[PDB]
């Protein structure tokens, strides 16, 4: 059971006020049973699309979560991942850069 890498990033360059899409890419995990949520201000976002799960040349799994969002000065956005390989759920915040 190897630990899942999480990377949060936006499709388009983020302007406050402007609609955009936010991606969470979960990689390098096995086994494939995984729980992925995308959070707004710590609360679960309702309409989150998932790509089909697949694996890389090294047999490790990956999956692309994404959702529509509008960034602001104040709102925080995260990706929270629950796995068998971790004791507690890992949470990566969207640093407004990405």
């Amino acid at each position: 059971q190897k630990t899942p890498q999480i990377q949060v990033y936006s499709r388009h360059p983020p302007e406050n006020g402007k609609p955009n899409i936010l991606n969470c890419y979960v990689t390098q995990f096995h086994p494939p049973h995984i729980e992925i949520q995308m959070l707004k201000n710590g609360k679960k976002i309702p309409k989150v699309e998932m790509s089909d799960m697949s694996f890389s040349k090294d047999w490790s799994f990956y999956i692309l979560a994404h959702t529509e969002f509008t960034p602001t000065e104040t709102d925080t956005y995260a990706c929270r991942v629950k796995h068998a390989s971790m004791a507690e759920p890992k949470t990566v915040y969207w640093d407004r850069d990405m």
């Binding site: 990377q7 990033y9 499709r11 899409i21 991606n23 890419y25 699309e49 790509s51 692309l64 994404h66 990405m98």
Partner: peptide, 12 residues
């Protein structure tokens, strides 16, 4: 190289 949902790519 990180994927976007619309089958284009992202890199930093």
């Amino acid at each position: 190289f990180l994927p976007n949902a619309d089958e284009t790519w992202y890199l930093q």
